Amino acid sequence: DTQWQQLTEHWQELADFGGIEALLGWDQSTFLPAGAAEDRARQQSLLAGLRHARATDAGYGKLLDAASSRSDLSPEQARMVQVARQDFEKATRIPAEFVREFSGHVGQSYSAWTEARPANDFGRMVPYLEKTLDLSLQAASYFPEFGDPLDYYINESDEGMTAEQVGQVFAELRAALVPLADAVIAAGAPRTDFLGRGFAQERQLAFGERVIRDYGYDFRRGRQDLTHHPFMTRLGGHDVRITTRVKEQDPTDALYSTLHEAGHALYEQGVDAAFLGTPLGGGVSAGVHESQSRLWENLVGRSRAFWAAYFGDWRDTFPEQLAGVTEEEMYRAVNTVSRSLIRTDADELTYNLHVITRFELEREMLAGKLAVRDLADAWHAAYEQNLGLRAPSDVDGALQDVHWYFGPIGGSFQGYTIGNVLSAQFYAAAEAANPGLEADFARKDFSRLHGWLRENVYRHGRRWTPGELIERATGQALTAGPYLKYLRGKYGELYGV
């Protein structure tokens, strides 16, 4: 009983270390002055070392063992203890010296990448990728329960997911989305030139903050700022911050980045107050998290009802830019499709082809079938086959994404595609329970959609495993069905295909 109070305080201390670490990273991406990079990284390592010591503290381990042997715990408290013991298990499996070696290597890899990408110097990154691949395999070998080292990373991203389950889902998406995208591309695109007329940055941000405020984003428990790369980060139990990036030459970039990151933040902001500061107080997996950003961005933000509700405010804010443009035309311009090179900018239909490419290259590298020095060539070859075009150099080829340069190789991307699928699966379950969602959206009323997602997804945090969470909320395990039905219906209707 006194042991439980001590466990509660140690858990709150781990959450507090995490919030402070998140602040160091949030400030690094937003306001850190250019000449202060090195000291900030050292500050981050200092905190990483301290937090790891507490996450692996032997006394804490004994407290967990004590609470675990009790028989009088509520379902939530026992699950809280179980999750803590699972985190403790993972944290102590890997020697702290290996953790530090890996962190220093990928940190140096990153710095080399920030220069080699603009310089089209993939040959320079090869030694960095070779060591990263070796370290990635070594890290997975501390977990022999995954015979396939790729399964260790897939599981780290989405508890319980396997490479065979991922490959199956990918196979289904490719078989369905390639024809649907090709048919949309062959039909021709809606008008888009009015999006290039000049949209003032401050006006874009104000519009975005009105929308996500309607969604339910709580500005007493967060804020938004500008960054080069949008992200969401939690600095505390009541401090969930988002960032966006604005292009005056295209207002859909900032709007949908903001809706996307806001979706992540709604998830975090809906976690039950009783779980904040405990091992259950956070999102449960990468795919479930990305299902919420994608739900508010795509399923809601790009829908006809969304623009039925906001076109008026939009045209008022941008009167000259929307002159001669109908509400229907703005709805179509937000749902264009094309074969493109940059994954983060890819449309709803071709996006997953980027993830599959990266996933299959990871499979090839981790299995020893593809040497890293051949990665640049294999990447272009996969882009030609999967997207029908190739980048002019390696800048937007294998150097495009930071993941393999600032972290392990393997399991880096499937969460994006799992999130896309689950977005429609969670959304369909929400509409099954609230058939008048679209009529609400037209009134700028998202309370029932938010209410359903909070009751069935957000509040539970980590109390359920991803698979339990998905099955309880939607009645079935991960399935591509609702996702494909939504896309075929939406784009079949948009392009007459």
Q: Which residues are catalytic?
A: 261
- 367 binds a copy of itself per the rule CB under 8 A: no
- 47 binds a copy of itself per the rule CB under 8 A: yes
Q: Where are any strands of DSSP class E within 41-128?
A: none
- 488 binds a copy of itself per the rule CB under 8 A: no
- 301 binds a copy of itself per the rule CB under 8 A: no
Helix (H) or strand (E) holding 7: helix 2-30
Are 188 and 329 in contact, with CB atoms under 8 Å apart? no
Give me the amino acid identity at 428: A
Q: Which stretch binds a copy of itself (CB under 8 A): 40-48, 98-106, 138-146, 442-450?
A: 40-48
Picking from 359, 494, 473, the residue whose alpha carbon sits closest to that of residue 427 is: 473
Nearest approach, Cβ of residue 84 and Zn ion (Å): 27
Residues 280-319 that bind Zn ion (CB under 5 A): 290, 293
Identify the residue among 100, 210, 221, 488 touching a copy of itself (CB under 8 A).
Answer: 221
The reply to whether 290 sits in an annotated binding site is yes
Are 92 and 26 in contact, with CB atoms under 8 Å apart? no
Picking from 158, 125, 186, the residue whose alpha carbon sits closest to that of residue 394 is: 125
CA distance 420 to 400: 21
Nearest approach, Cβ of residue 29 and a copy of itself (Å): 13
User: DSSP 3-state assignment of 333?
Assistant: helix
Partnered with residue 495 across adjacent β-strands are none
Which is nearer to a copy of itself, 46 or 206 (by Cβ)? 46
What b/e readout covers 389-422, taking b as 16+ CB neighbours within 10 angstroms?
A: ebbeebbbbbbbbeebbbbbbbbbbbbbbbbbbb
Nearest approach, Cβ of residue 246 and a copy of itself (Å): 17
- 328 binds a copy of itself per the rule CB under 8 A: no
Cα–Cα distances in Å, from 361 out to 149, 371, 391, 411, 431? 14, 10, 17, 11, 37
Nearest approach, Cβ of residue 50 and Zn ion (Å): 29
Nearest approach, Cβ of residue 344 and Zn ion (Å): 9
Identify how many contiguous H helices and E strands the chain contains and give both numbers: 21, 3
- Which of the choices Zn ion, a copy of itself, none does residue 293 contact, using the CB cut-off of 5 to 8 A by kind? Zn ion
Which is nearer to a copy of itself, 32 or 395 (by Cβ)? 32
CA distance 274 to 282: 12
Identify the residue among 212, 235, 322, 469 touching a copy of itself (CB under 8 A).
Answer: 235
- 27 binds a copy of itself per the rule CB under 8 A: yes
Angle at which helices 466-474 and 414-433 cross, to 10°: 30
In sequence order, which residues have a C-beta less than 8 Å from that of residue 344 and are 6 or more positions away?
none
Q: Residues in contact with a copy of itself, total (CB under 8 A)?
A: 36
DSSP 119: T
Residues 147-206 that bind a copy of itself (CB under 8 A): none
Which is nearer to a copy of itself, 70 or 213 (by Cβ)? 213
CA distance 367 to 135: 14
- 228 binds a copy of itself per the rule CB under 8 A: no
Nearest approach, Cβ of residue 450 and a copy of itself (Å): 18
Are 183 and 233 in contact, with CB atoms under 8 Å apart? no
Which is nearer to a copy of itself, 37 or 477 (by Cβ)? 37
Are 259 and 278 in contact, with CB atoms under 8 Å apart? no
The reply to whether 260 sits in an annotated binding site is yes
Are 448 and 437 in contact, with CB atoms under 8 Å apart? yes
Classify the C-alpha dihedral 195-196-202-205 as positive or negative.
Answer: positive
At 97, list the tokens: 């010296």
- 6 binds a copy of itself per the rule CB under 8 A: no
Helix (H) or strand (E) holding 232: strand 232-236
- 237 binds a copy of itself per the rule CB under 8 A: yes
Identify the residue among 6, 25, 40, 494 touching a copy of itself (CB under 8 A).
Answer: 40
- 423 binds Zn ion per the rule CB under 5 A: no
Identify the residue among 6, 8, 12, 56 touching a copy of itself (CB under 8 A).
Answer: 12
Q: Which stretch binds a copy of itself (CB under 8 A): 36-44, 150-158, 204-212, 366-374?
A: 36-44
Which is nearer to Zn ion, 20 or 402 (by Cβ)? 402
Nearest approach, Cβ of residue 63 and Zn ion (Å): 35
Partnered with residue 233 across adjacent β-strands are 241
- 43 binds a copy of itself per the rule CB under 8 A: yes
What is the contact surface with Zn ion in residues (CB under 5 A)? 290, 293
What is the contact surface with a copy of itself in residues (CB under 8 A)? 12-13, 16-17, 19-20, 23-24, 27, 31-36, 38-40, 42-43, 46-47, 50, 218-223, 225, 235-239, 241
Residues annotated within a binding site for Zn(2+): 260, 264, 290
